[PDB]
Amino acid sequence: AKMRISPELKKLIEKYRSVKDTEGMSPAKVYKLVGENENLYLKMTDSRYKGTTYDVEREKDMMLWLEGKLPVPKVLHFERHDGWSNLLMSEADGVLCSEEYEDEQSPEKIIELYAECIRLFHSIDISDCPYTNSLDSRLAELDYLLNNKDPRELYDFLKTEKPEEELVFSHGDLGDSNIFVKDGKVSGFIDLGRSGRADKWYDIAFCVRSIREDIGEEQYVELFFDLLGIKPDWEKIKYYILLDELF
Amino acid sequence: SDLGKKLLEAARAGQDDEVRILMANGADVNANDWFGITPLHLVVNNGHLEIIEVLLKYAADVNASDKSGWTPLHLAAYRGHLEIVEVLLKYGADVNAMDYQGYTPLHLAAEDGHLEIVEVLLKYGADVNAQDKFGKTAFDISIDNGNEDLAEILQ
Ligand SMILES: Nc1ncnc2c1ncn2[C@@H]1O[C@H](COP(=O)(O)OP(=O)(O)O)[C@@H](O)[C@H]1O
Ligand SMILES: [Mg+2]
C-alpha cells in the first residue's frame, strides 16, 4: 500500500521499463529505466544512509555542483519519500570503461585514463565545494554504518601518523565502474556520493591499488606517476589504502 | 571542526601539547566519535604515559569501554607497556573487564606473552579462572605459545 517512490514520480516514469542493476555493490538500489527514445537511471538510498557519503542526496548535490566542471549525468528529479532518497538522472555519455576496455587487453590505456582523471580533478576550483572528506568524517560514518568485532587493526591504524593534507577535488571511488569513455576522452563520471574536497593522495592511492591488483606490475605504477608528472609518496599512498582496508 | 573532534585527533596523533591546550579550552574529556573510542583509549594506544594522568585529572573515565568492549586496560595489555598498565590500575581500572570475545586484559597479555604485565594484573586481583566465550581460558593460550614461562607462573 505504501510505495518507496512518490505517486508523482511513479507517474513520471510509467512508460519506461525498469531493469534493476544486478552488478552494483553499494547500499543503493539502481534501476535502468529503458525508454523508447532514451534511458534514465534511478538511484535510491534508505533513511539510515541519510547524511552519509552513501546518501543519494549528496550525490545529487555534487552532480549539480559539478555541472560545467566535469562531465556528469543531469539531475532530472530528486525527492525524499518515507525516509528514502530518490534521484532520477540521465544516462552517461559513452561506455563504462571496465566493460569495453579493461578486456581490450591494453593496460597502458587504463593507467592513462586514471592519470587523465587525476588531472581533471586537480583543475577544479573547490573554494565553494559543498562537501569535505577527512579522517574523522570517514571514521564517524563507519561508526554509523555499523550501528546494528576484532579491534586490533583499527588501533594499529590509528597509531599510524597521518600525512598533512593538500586538498583537491576528489572522486572518492575512482574506478572504471564509475568512469565512462568515448572516442578517446573521459566522457562521464558516476557514483559521486563520496566526492568533494579531500587529500590528493586519496584518489591516487586508489589508482595505485587498482593498478596493483588488477594489472600487477611495478613499472605500470611507475608509468602512472610519469603520466602525472609527480614523484610517489609511498607513505601517503600506504596510509590511505590502510584506511580504506578497515573492514 | 569542533573541540571534540580536534581533541580526538590530537590524542590520536600523539600531540600532548595540543591535548593540553584543548582540555584547557573546554574540550569534552569523554568525547567519542567513532567506535566508543575516547581520548584516553587513544593516548594509551600510543604509549603516552604523561598525558594519561592529565586526562584522568580532567576526570577521564578509566573504564570507558569502546564498541568492542576494549577498555584502556585491554589496550595497554595489547600494547605491552608495563608503565601504562600500572598507572591505569592505580586509578581504578577494572582488572576483570570483558570484551566481546570475552577476553579480560589478562587474556590479552597472555596472548602477547607480556609476562611482567601478567604479574601485575594478577596482584590487582585478576581472576585466572576467567573463561572467554569459546571456553578457552588464559591457560589454553599458554599452550598456543608452548611456554614453560607463563604456565610455570600459574598454580
Ligand atoms: N547515469 C548513469 N548512466 C549510465 N549507467 C549508470 C548510470 N548510473 C548508474 N549506472 C550503472 O549502474 C551501475 C552502478 O551504479 P552506481 O551509481 O555506480 O552505484 P554504486 O554506488 O552501488 O556503485 C554503474 O556501474 C553503471 O553500470
Ligand atoms: Mg557508491
Ligand SMILES: [Mg+2]
Ligand atoms: Mg559506482
